[PDB]
């Protein structure tokens, strides 16, 4: 930022870019190292009612896997694991470099 205008023009011509507009070194635009104290918000479970843990106990909703067929327990169309992948559209922003 402390460069002379002749050196700035030489750098700009030699690089082909405006180097002074986007400087690599941070001078004053950064935030202050001393910040005001925060106040973090609370989540949805921070309520005094209608908040029984058994109504939001996601860890106990896990069940053992369902056995489709087993060697001891156990005209239709051929199927696939999923519907086939749709083709990606070419980007309308910048399709080629």
């Amino acid at each position: 930022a402390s460069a002379t205008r002749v050196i700035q023009k030489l750098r700009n011509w030699a690089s082909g870019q405006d180097l002074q507009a986007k400087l690599q070194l941070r001078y004053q635009e950064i935030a202050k190292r001393t910040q005001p104290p925060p106040k973090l918000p609370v989540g949805p479970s921070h309520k005094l009612s209608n908040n029984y843990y058994c109504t939001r106990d996601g860890r106990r909703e896990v069940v053992p896997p369902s056995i489709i067929m087993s060697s001891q327990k156990a005209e239709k169309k051929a199927v696939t694991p999923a519907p086939p992948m749709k083709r990606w559209e070419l980007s309308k922003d910048q399709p080629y470099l």
């Binding site: 309520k47 005094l48 009612s49 209608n50």
Partner: protein
């Protein structure tokens, strides 16, 4: 009768009923159950418009705190907790979410105890929250205004 505000019709264990349902209510077990109350010892406590209703209910909960035998955890801890919350409610020192919190505390006490003192202590709080909830909210709002 126009000055009448509330009646506790079966002693302190039964909850309160306001004047509007006091107009045409009978003194049956079944009639008071339909009025969401009970006929207990047939003790008709009458409170007029000059009554501090929250103070009366908190005095009843303080009585239940003093007379709980302390043997079983829901009655012991929950009735003490209800007494503290009701004292703060009388002072106005709470927020309206604590009304729902107190309702859930009373529902946790009711039916989980050894004898029916827990039910008889949770019922007046249930009746007060069911009927005189805008009075509680008015007290909390007045406290919040005059303290900040």
């Amino acid at each position: 009768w126009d000055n009448l505000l509330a009646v506790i019709p079966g002693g302190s264990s039964t909850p309160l009923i306001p004047k509007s349902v006091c107009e045409t209510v009978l003194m049956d077990f079944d009639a008071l159950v339909q009025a969401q109350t009970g006929l207990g010892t047939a003790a008709v406590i009458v409170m007029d418009r000059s009554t501090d209703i929250v103070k009366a209910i908190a005095r009843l909960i303080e009585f239940y705190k003093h007379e709980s035998c302390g043997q079983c955890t829901p009655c012991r801890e929950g009735v003490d907790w209800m007494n503290k919350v009701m004292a703060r409610f009388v002072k106005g020192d709470a927020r309206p979410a604590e009304i729902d919190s107190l309702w859930e505390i009373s529902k946790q006490i009711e039916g989980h105890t050894i004898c029916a003192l827990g039910d008889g202590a949770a019922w007046p709080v249930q009746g007060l929250i069911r009927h005189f909830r805008p009075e509680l909210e008015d007290r909390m709002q007045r406290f919040a205004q005059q303290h900040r």
